[PDB]
């Protein structure tokens, strides 16, 4: 688990490309509630496997939101995993 960039006691949960930062949910709230400009920053949940990279693909069959590398590694393990249909995740808010 990659730690939060703006505090000490928590592991990250979200990633913001605009700030190039990995934040726990509390720090996400503290940072992007300050004003409207920050509130317009698009953020994405962290990968649920490695928890070190922004999530990029949602697989409902796996019930998992994974980053690019983890998506490729999970769905190259065998022909059953390959058949899984994944949907790209988009940053929001």
**Binding region for its own copies (CB under 8 A) out of 27-35, 48-56, 67-75, 82-90:** 82-90
Q: Which residues pair with 92 in a beta bridge?
A: 43
Binder of its own copies out of 7, 60, 76, 82 (CB under 8 A): 60
Q: Which H helix or E strand runs over 25?
A: helix 25-32
Q: With respect to its own copies, which residue has the nearer C-beta, 78 or 93?
A: 93
- Compute the residue count for the chain: 93
Instruction: Work out whether 18 is an interface residue with its own copies (CB under 8 A).
Output: no
Q: Nearest distance from residue 44's CB to its own copies, in Å? A: 9
State the Cα–Cα distance between residues 75 and 52, nearest whole angstrom: 19
């Amino acid at each position: 688990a990659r730690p939060c960039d703006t505090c000490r006691s928590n592991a990250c949960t979200v990633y913001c490309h605009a700030d190039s930062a990995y934040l726990c949910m509390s720090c996400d709230a503290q940072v992007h509630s300050a004003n409207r400009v920050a509130s317009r920053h698009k953020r994405v949940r962290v990968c649920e496997s490695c928890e070190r990279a922004p999530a990029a693909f949602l697989c409902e069959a796996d019930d998992a939101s994974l980053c690019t590398a983890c998506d490729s590694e999970v769905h190259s393990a065998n022909p059953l995993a390959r058949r899984h249909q994944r949907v790209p995740i988009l940053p929001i808010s």
